[PDB]
DNA sequence: ATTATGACGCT
DNA sequence: AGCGTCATA
């Protein structure tokens, strides 16, 4: 123990948005602000698909993935703001620019990893160093974490929620050993300050609220900031584990809520992610496999390594639309028209990208969907992007996808194709 | 008939 | 390269 490397050598924070493209509809409507509202995806099937949901919408069951006329019947005065449409399908412009917005303040305190449109990592590592040598070892004052909660207190020998949290902060900071510049729980406690001060700032310069966690890496980092959501920080610390994971369902964890997750509880009969510290590093390897394995024995115990990429933009740019039931594309015009309202939203996105960004993509990939089949993706083709014109990718796409037409004659389209999708991918310097 | 994305791992 | 998994609004 005295070798055994404690996995808290980095500050790692993990900042997401509170309901985000909510919150970008109230601000540009004022109408919608402190009302339940949902953000919907079309109208005309079932109302819509519900994909962003306020939180005073959640207190009456409203989902996401729920369709707007029966998130209607849960609540009846649920206000709904639309996702632009242009050349036929949904357009999320709007929401990757207010995204922009929040990841270029973001980049002011540190090196960030876009994580999705609405949330990125933070390694605060150096930071804290920084601040913890301004800071002459005076003690932080709880004035300085006004909206942190530390996980786990107050424990040990008042009924509201904002007394509770501060009964626990001042546990924390009670116990803290500030004479330390090395204590991983106080670099935790400095991470946090700047995570205040980096939620200010969004929230001054964008009027979007967020929610954040802090603690050694990016794992424990996202599953702090879901604790106290909206609006809150969470400092989940290194000790904070044990207790934490033992009740943690498995597939709570970046990465286990899918297959791998269930196969963990199938196979080894446990519920919780604090079970795992029972299995050897070799028997989780021999059921998972080697790096699943060895990630799984370390993650149970609040360690994992996954660095924060130094990685804001997205990279890959893509368009799609699905044309379900009876939509689906059967005739060759068809499918022509729509790869080119496609490749004409790429384009324009395309454009923007290299003047902001200075980068050229060069690789195009088609991919569609057949009816009666299979999964997200039927069939995925790559070929040369060499030029930003919407009507060559287009053109190309269609070339590289025509021979999945069983159909006798070609003007038909068999069987008929229930999604288009188009991605520019492979970007280089410009 | 959730839809529209976007990253990463496997072979 | 193409496929599959997991994730987010
Ligand atoms: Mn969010
Ligand atoms: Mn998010």
Known sequence: GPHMATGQDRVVALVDMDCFFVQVE?????????????????????????????????????????????????????????????????????????????????????????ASIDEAYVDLTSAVQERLQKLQGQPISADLLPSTYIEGLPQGPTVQKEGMRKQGLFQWLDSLQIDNLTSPDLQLTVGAVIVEEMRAAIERETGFQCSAGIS????????????????????????????????????????????????????????????????????????????????????????????????????????????????????????????????????????????????????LVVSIRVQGDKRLSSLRRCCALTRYDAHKMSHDAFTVIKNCNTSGIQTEWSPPLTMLFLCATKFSAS
Request: charge should be positive; aromatic fraction near 6%; hydrophobic fraction near 35%.
């Open 216 to 363: 050694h890496n990016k794992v424990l980092a996202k599953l702090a900031c879901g604790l106290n959501k909206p609006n809150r920080q969470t400092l989940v610390s290194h000790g904070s584990v044990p207790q934490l994971f033992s009740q943690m369902p498995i597939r709570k964890i970046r990465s286990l809520g899918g297959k791998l997750g269930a196969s963990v509880i199938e196979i080894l009969g446990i519920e919780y992610m604090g079970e795992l510290t029972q299995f050897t590093e070799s028997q989780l390897q021999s059921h998972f496999g080697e790096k699943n394995g060895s990630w799984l024995y370390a993650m149970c115990r609040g360690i994992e390594h996954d660095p924060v990429k130094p990685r804001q933009l997205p990279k890959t740019i893509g368009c799609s639309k699905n044309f379900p039931g009876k939509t689906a594309l059967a005739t060759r015009e068809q499918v022509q028209w729509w790869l080119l309202q496609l490749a004409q939203e790429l384009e324009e996105r395309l454009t923007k990208d290299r003047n902001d960004n200075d980068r050229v993509a060069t690789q």
């Open 26 to 114: 109230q601000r540009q409507n004022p109408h919608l602000r402190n009302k339940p509202c949902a953000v919907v995806q079309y109208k005309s099937w079932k109302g819509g698909g519900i994909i962003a949901v306020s939180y005073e919408a959640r207190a009456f069951g409203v989902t996401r993935s729920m369709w707007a006329d029966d998130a209607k019947k849960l609540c009846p005065d649920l206000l709904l703001a639309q996702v632009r449409e242009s050349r036929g399908k949904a357009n999320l412009t709007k929401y990757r620019e207010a995204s922009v917005e929040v990841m270029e303040i973001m980049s002011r305190f540190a090196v960030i990893e876009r």
